[PDB]
Ligand binder design. Structure first.
Ligand SMILES: CN1CCC2(CC1)NC(=O)c1c(c3ccc(Cl)c(Cl)c3n1C)[C@H]2C#N
Ligand SMILES: [Cl-]
Lengths: 10, 272
């Protein structure tokens, strides 16, 4: 249910 | 000449940094990653005893037979970009996708991976390089050998003992003193990012999304994690930078004892 995301390196 | 020596294959990824392709060295079929970095987005520049991206300087400093860090095999300049040739493990999966697909890792697996990241980061620091973007997205798993490789030196710096006041890595892996004061020391900031990473491994995602969470000093565990592992995590995530362990303290921690070898790690957890 909870959303896992990549995160931008900047 | 770049276009002569490598056969380009499929795009492996792209983003702010530029674009990376699967490739093979024609000379001997060695798998490689071909990374195109636009000059317009290179912020930090170094000098080879030539003007290159700091990334190229840092990569050359950590270049060696030690597998824990991606090896730069070659690099080229073009009018609007640099092209970097990196060695490519085959078969490979990044640690982000691996955690997404498998969920929360068994502690034995998390221990093996985390130990190997520690060794790779120690290698960087001893080569005078601070990575500044340690995260699951920037770790490749050699799925056959069970060996991890730290990648993506595009936010890195030369290691120093004084404060950094610049940062362009990943904010959710950045420490509270950066969020609050735009200041950090290299080693203690690296340990914080390692705490985030270990939590990510044993819980299946990172602990914090928001600035208020990062500075708040509470680590809620969403999965069953051993007391010893929670302790280590919470020590790495100490709000005061000087309360965080050294790499030696981390590797001497009771949770870190009796690590699997990489080949055992592949056999037990990866071969499928
Ligand atoms: C945030 N990071 C992720 C690694 C980064 C640069 C950006 N992006 C990738 O997509 C990537 C990178 C890779 C480097 C080497 C190898 Cl063998 C692979 Cl397979 C790589 N991939 C898939 C990085 C780049 N460029
Ligand atoms: Cl990279």
């Amino acid at each position: 249910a909870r959303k896992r995301r990549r995160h931008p390196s900047g | 000449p770049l276009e002569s020596q490598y056969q380009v294959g499929p795009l492996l990824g792209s983003g702010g940094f530029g674009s990376v392709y699967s490739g093979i060295r024609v000379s001997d079929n060695l798998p490689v990653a071909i990374k195109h970095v636009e000059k317009d987005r290179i912020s930090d520049w170094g000098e080879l005893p030539t003007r290159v991206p700091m990334e190229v300087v840092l990569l050359k400093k950590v270049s060696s037979g030690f597998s824990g860090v991606i090896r730069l095999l070659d690099w080229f300049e073009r009018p609007d970009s640099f092209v970097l040739i990196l060695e490519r493990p085959e078969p490979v999966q990044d640690l982000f996708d691996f955690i997404t697909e498998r969920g929360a890792l068994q502690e034995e697996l998390a221990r093996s991976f985390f130990w190997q990241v520690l060794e790779a980061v120690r290698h960087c620091h001893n080569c005078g390089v601070l990575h500044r973007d340690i995260k699951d997205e920037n770790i490749l798993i050699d799925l056959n050998r069970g060996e991890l490789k730290l990648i993506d030196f595009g936010s890195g710096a030369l290691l120093k003992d004084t404060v950094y006041t610049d940062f362009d890595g990943t904010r959710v892996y950045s420490p509270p003193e950066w969020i609050r004061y735009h200041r950090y020391h290299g080693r203690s900031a690296a340990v914080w990012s390692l705490g985030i990473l270990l939590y990510d491994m044993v819980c299946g995602d990172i602990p914090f999304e928001h600035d208020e969470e990062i500075i708040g000093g509470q680590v809620f565990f969403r999965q069953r994690v051993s007391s010893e592992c929670q302790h280590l995590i919470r020590w790495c995530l100490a709000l005061r930078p000087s309360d965080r362990p050294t790499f030696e303290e981390i590797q001497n921690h009771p949770w870190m004892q009796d690590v699997l070898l990489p080949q055992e790690t592949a056999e037990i957890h990866l071969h499928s």
